[PDB]
Scaffold this active site. Structure first.
Site, PDB file in Angstrom:
ATOM      1  N   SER B  34      50.851 -10.813 -63.546  1.00  0.00           N
ATOM      2  CA  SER B  34      51.621  -9.580 -63.487  1.00  0.00           C
ATOM      3  C   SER B  34      53.013  -9.779 -64.085  1.00  0.00           C
ATOM      4  O   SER B  34      53.537  -8.889 -64.760  1.00  0.00           O
ATOM      5  CB  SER B  34      51.722  -9.103 -62.038  1.00  0.00           C
ATOM      6  OG  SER B  34      52.460  -7.906 -61.952  1.00  0.00           O
ATOM      7  N   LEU B  41      59.630  -7.443 -61.463  1.00  0.00           N
ATOM      8  CA  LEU B  41      60.059  -6.082 -61.206  1.00  0.00           C
ATOM      9  C   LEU B  41      61.086  -5.986 -60.084  1.00  0.00           C
ATOM     10  O   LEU B  41      61.891  -5.053 -60.058  1.00  0.00           O
ATOM     11  CB  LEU B  41      58.868  -5.221 -60.797  1.00  0.00           C
ATOM     12  CG  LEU B  41      57.714  -5.141 -61.791  1.00  0.00           C
ATOM     13  CD1 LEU B  41      56.442  -4.656 -61.100  1.00  0.00           C
ATOM     14  CD2 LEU B  41      58.156  -4.204 -62.922  1.00  0.00           C
ATOM     15  N   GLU B  59      60.239 -16.877 -53.289  1.00  0.00           N
ATOM     16  CA  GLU B  59      59.677 -18.168 -53.668  1.00  0.00           C
ATOM     17  C   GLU B  59      58.398 -18.002 -54.488  1.00  0.00           C
ATOM     18  O   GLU B  59      58.160 -18.770 -55.435  1.00  0.00           O
ATOM     19  CB  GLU B  59      59.423 -19.010 -52.409  1.00  0.00           C
ATOM     20  CG  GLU B  59      58.683 -20.340 -52.668  1.00  0.00           C
ATOM     21  CD  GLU B  59      59.568 -21.586 -52.697  1.00  0.00           C
ATOM     22  OE1 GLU B  59      60.700 -21.513 -53.219  1.00  0.00           O
ATOM     23  OE2 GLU B  59      59.107 -22.654 -52.200  1.00  0.00           O
ATOM     24  N   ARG B  61      57.622 -15.431 -56.462  1.00  0.00           N
ATOM     25  CA  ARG B  61      58.074 -14.997 -57.777  1.00  0.00           C
ATOM     26  C   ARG B  61      58.640 -16.164 -58.576  1.00  0.00           C
ATOM     27  O   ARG B  61      58.462 -16.246 -59.789  1.00  0.00           O
ATOM     28  CB  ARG B  61      59.129 -13.893 -57.623  1.00  0.00           C
ATOM     29  CG  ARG B  61      58.533 -12.490 -57.404  1.00  0.00           C
ATOM     30  CD  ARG B  61      59.582 -11.498 -56.863  1.00  0.00           C
ATOM     31  NE  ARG B  61      59.795 -11.693 -55.430  1.00  0.00           N
ATOM     32  CZ  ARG B  61      60.786 -11.149 -54.717  1.00  0.00           C
ATOM     33  NH1 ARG B  61      61.670 -10.353 -55.297  1.00  0.00           N
ATOM     34  NH2 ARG B  61      60.860 -11.403 -53.422  1.00  0.00           N
ATOM     35  N   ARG B  96      57.159  -4.367 -43.826  1.00  0.00           N
ATOM     36  CA  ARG B  96      56.549  -3.677 -44.952  1.00  0.00           C
ATOM     37  C   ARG B  96      55.083  -3.440 -44.594  1.00  0.00           C
ATOM     38  O   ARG B  96      54.532  -4.101 -43.707  1.00  0.00           O
ATOM     39  CB  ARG B  96      56.691  -4.464 -46.250  1.00  0.00           C
ATOM     40  CG  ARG B  96      55.872  -5.740 -46.345  1.00  0.00           C
ATOM     41  CD  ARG B  96      56.425  -6.594 -47.480  1.00  0.00           C
ATOM     42  NE  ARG B  96      55.548  -7.712 -47.788  1.00  0.00           N
ATOM     43  CZ  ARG B  96      55.832  -8.685 -48.655  1.00  0.00           C
ATOM     44  NH1 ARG B  96      56.982  -8.716 -49.325  1.00  0.00           N
ATOM     45  NH2 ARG B  96      54.959  -9.643 -48.858  1.00  0.00           N
TER      46      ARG B  96
HETATM   47  N1  CDP Z   1      65.891  -3.844 -42.971  1.00  0.00           N
HETATM   48  C1  CDP Z   1      64.906  -3.853 -44.021  1.00  0.00           C
HETATM   49  C2  CDP Z   1      63.541  -4.238 -43.715  1.00  0.00           C
HETATM   50  C3  CDP Z   1      62.611  -4.217 -44.820  1.00  0.00           C
HETATM   51  N2  CDP Z   1      63.042  -3.886 -46.150  1.00  0.00           N
HETATM   52  C4  CDP Z   1      62.145  -3.921 -47.243  1.00  0.00           C
HETATM   53  O1  CDP Z   1      61.578  -2.537 -47.179  1.00  0.00           O
HETATM   54  C5  CDP Z   1      60.403  -2.629 -48.116  1.00  0.00           C
HETATM   55  C6  CDP Z   1      59.254  -1.800 -47.424  1.00  0.00           C
HETATM   56  O2  CDP Z   1      58.105  -1.992 -48.211  1.00  0.00           O
HETATM   57  P1  CDP Z   1      56.969  -0.801 -48.073  1.00  0.00           P
HETATM   58  O3  CDP Z   1      56.023  -0.983 -49.197  1.00  0.00           O
HETATM   59  O4  CDP Z   1      56.363  -0.915 -46.671  1.00  0.00           O
HETATM   60  O5  CDP Z   1      57.639   0.666 -48.169  1.00  0.00           O
HETATM   61  P2  CDP Z   1      58.478   1.272 -49.377  1.00  0.00           P
HETATM   62  O6  CDP Z   1      59.866   1.400 -48.825  1.00  0.00           O
HETATM   63  O7  CDP Z   1      58.463   0.429 -50.639  1.00  0.00           O
HETATM   64  O8  CDP Z   1      57.901   2.603 -49.586  1.00  0.00           O
HETATM   65  C7  CDP Z   1      60.070  -3.889 -48.227  1.00  0.00           C
HETATM   66  O9  CDP Z   1      60.367  -4.429 -49.517  1.00  0.00           O
HETATM   67  C8  CDP Z   1      61.093  -4.660 -47.183  1.00  0.00           C
HETATM   68  O10 CDP Z   1      61.474  -5.997 -47.730  1.00  0.00           O
HETATM   69  C9  CDP Z   1      64.457  -3.469 -46.420  1.00  0.00           C
HETATM   70  O11 CDP Z   1      64.842  -3.152 -47.562  1.00  0.00           O
HETATM   71  N3  CDP Z   1      65.324  -3.495 -45.328  1.00  0.00           N
HETATM   72  N1  CDP Z   2      55.325  -8.192 -61.933  1.00  0.00           N
HETATM   73  C1  CDP Z   2      55.706  -8.200 -60.544  1.00  0.00           C
HETATM   74  C2  CDP Z   2      54.756  -8.038 -59.432  1.00  0.00           C
HETATM   75  C3  CDP Z   2      55.264  -8.066 -58.077  1.00  0.00           C
HETATM   76  N2  CDP Z   2      56.663  -8.233 -57.843  1.00  0.00           N
HETATM   77  C4  CDP Z   2      57.216  -8.243 -56.517  1.00  0.00           C
HETATM   78  O1  CDP Z   2      57.012  -9.725 -56.099  1.00  0.00           O
HETATM   79  C5  CDP Z   2      57.226  -9.617 -54.606  1.00  0.00           C
HETATM   80  C6  CDP Z   2      56.110 -10.626 -54.084  1.00  0.00           C
HETATM   81  O2  CDP Z   2      56.259 -10.604 -52.710  1.00  0.00           O
HETATM   82  P1  CDP Z   2      55.787 -11.924 -51.827  1.00  0.00           P
HETATM   83  O3  CDP Z   2      56.252 -11.796 -50.417  1.00  0.00           O
HETATM   84  O4  CDP Z   2      54.285 -12.072 -51.939  1.00  0.00           O
HETATM   85  O5  CDP Z   2      56.433 -13.274 -52.531  1.00  0.00           O
HETATM   86  P2  CDP Z   2      57.935 -13.683 -52.738  1.00  0.00           P
HETATM   87  O6  CDP Z   2      58.179 -13.693 -54.172  1.00  0.00           O
HETATM   88  O7  CDP Z   2      58.866 -12.706 -51.965  1.00  0.00           O
HETATM   89  O8  CDP Z   2      58.052 -15.053 -52.201  1.00  0.00           O
HETATM   90  C7  CDP Z   2      57.033  -8.394 -54.221  1.00  0.00           C
HETATM   91  O9  CDP Z   2      58.273  -7.869 -53.709  1.00  0.00           O
HETATM   92  C8  CDP Z   2      56.572  -7.607 -55.600  1.00  0.00           C
HETATM   93  O10 CDP Z   2      56.958  -6.203 -55.575  1.00  0.00           O
HETATM   94  C9  CDP Z   2      57.615  -8.425 -58.980  1.00  0.00           C
HETATM   95  O11 CDP Z   2      58.829  -8.606 -58.779  1.00  0.00           O
HETATM   96  N3  CDP Z   2      57.117  -8.384 -60.304  1.00  0.00           N
HETATM   97 CA    CA Z   3      60.995 -16.630 -50.028  1.00  0.00          CA
HETATM   98 CA    CA Z   4      58.559 -12.082 -49.882  1.00  0.00          CA
END
Ligand code: CDP
Ligand code: CDP
Ligand code: CA
Ligand code: CA
Ligand code: CA
Ligand code: CA
Lengths: 198, 199
Positions: B34, B41, B59, B61, B96
């Site tokens: 991706s 992203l 980590e 990413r 999330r």
């Molecule tokens: N206090 C918080 C708790 C979670 N988050 C993030 O809120 C995002 C929620 O993901 P989601 O897919 O359930 O909902 P969306 O807000 O993307 O629609 C996640 O990326 C969390 O890391 C935040 O920005 N602030």
């Molecule tokens: N091409 C992509 C695909 C996913 N992502 C994001 O990579 C994050 C992966 O979440 P994760 O909890 O599995 O791994 P970490 O990178 O936070 O360790 C998510 O917040 C995705 O939205 C991105 O930055 N670029």
């Molecule tokens: Ca991490």
């Molecule tokens: Ca993460």
């Protein structure tokens, strides 16, 4: 170089390609609580339109911010084709891995110790219910081998929770071997554990 | 003025409070794919160390960016206490909600139509396997009331797939009622369908 902008809630518009079809009120209350504790930690992705800003990633955060009484959210504003907006609406959610039940439980346990908190205090700080934290920490009282089996996926977490109900631990390890060898479901295990207990 | 900086891969340090103990190689390859299609992203969150930067979120990413051959990743640098770093390391993952199997399937269907792609082409574009896509699309051939059970999590996606194997569709509703009342797993449903299909 991109910046994180504070976008007024009144200027935000729905994700036109929203893949989520249900917004669970309980889960939104958890997110609300976390936003009250920490603010929004992750900037939204939005795209500027004639009428305002369309959300590409962040509809739940937006709803949580409103519940929390905030008047702005942090966002990265990007120029994006319709095709990219359709793809990213999915990918931001799809290309991620959640933590396992045991990684979550170990995290709670690490925070209890290093933040010097009670379970009630940790639930508040994290925006989770007190039962949710307690049920996960209970998994850490199972024998080490059974925790391993759960992590490896050889046992479900539901089996793990059910095993906590066994009175006589003398039958615990033979019970797990039976579950695995016979590929028993959680309900069958509940029924075996009730008789063994009685 | 918070900014997104491109930070050199060489300057990043692992998350001191990393809650993840298992980094699945297959899932990292998906993320790598991706990143090759779309870039990273979502900016990583990092904190300045005495030299370099500690990852607070990102980590996977980071490792995918190494696999993809990137030189830098996008990151937001924040001043954070140790307590905040420990909290955020969990919370960014904990708070999330995933998409349901049906929401994923509906999204694939929408993207196939609106981007005019085959399953294989969409799989390449999203960093997922072609069977992963095809198998989710099959859920959309189930009756709507069973789709809803899958959407709600009363039935798993594996149950959904297995129910497709049923020859006589008149037995579908009674079979599902049995699966739910008795909390049967996929293997036990396979066996019941095995028997129902033998006349
Ligand atoms: N206090 C918080 C708790 C979670 N988050 C993030 O809120 C995002 C929620 O993901 P989601 O897919 O359930 O909902 P969306 O807000 O993307 O629609 C996640 O990326 C969390 O890391 C935040 O920005 N602030
Ligand atoms: N091409 C992509 C695909 C996913 N992502 C994001 O990579 C994050 C992966 O979440 P994760 O909890 O599995 O791994 P970490 O990178 O936070 O360790 C998510 O917040 C995705 O939205 C991105 O930055 N670029
Ligand atoms: Ca991490
Ligand atoms: Ca993460
Ligand atoms: Ca969204
Ligand atoms: Ca999301």
């Amino acid at each position: 170089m991109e910046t994180v902008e504070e976008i007024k809630i009144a200027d935000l518009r729905p994700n036109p390609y929203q893949p989520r079809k249900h917004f669970d009120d309980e889960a939104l209350a958890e997110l609300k609580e976390s936003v009250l504790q920490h603010g929004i930690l992750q900037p939204l992705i939005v795209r500027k339109s004639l009428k305002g800003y369309d959300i590409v990633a962040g509809e739940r955060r937006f709803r949580a911010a409103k519940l929390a009484g905030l008047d702005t959210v942090p966002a990265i504003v990007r120029e994006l084709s319709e095709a990219l907006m359709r793809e990213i609406a999915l990918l931001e959610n799809l290309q991620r891995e959640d933590l396992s039940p045991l990684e979550e439980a170990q995290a709670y346990d690490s925070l209890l110790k290093h933040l010097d908190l009670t379970q009630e205090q940790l639930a508040k700080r994290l925006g989770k219910s007190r039962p949710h934290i307690a049920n996960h920490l209970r998994l850490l009282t199972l024998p080490e081998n059974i925790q391993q089996l759960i992590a490896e996926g050889t046992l479900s977490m539901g089996h793990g929770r059910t095993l906590l109900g066994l009175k006589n631990k003398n039958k615990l390890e033979p019970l797990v071997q039976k579950v695995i060898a016979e590929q028993l479901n959680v309900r069958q295990l509940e029924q075996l554990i009730q008789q063994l207990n009685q």
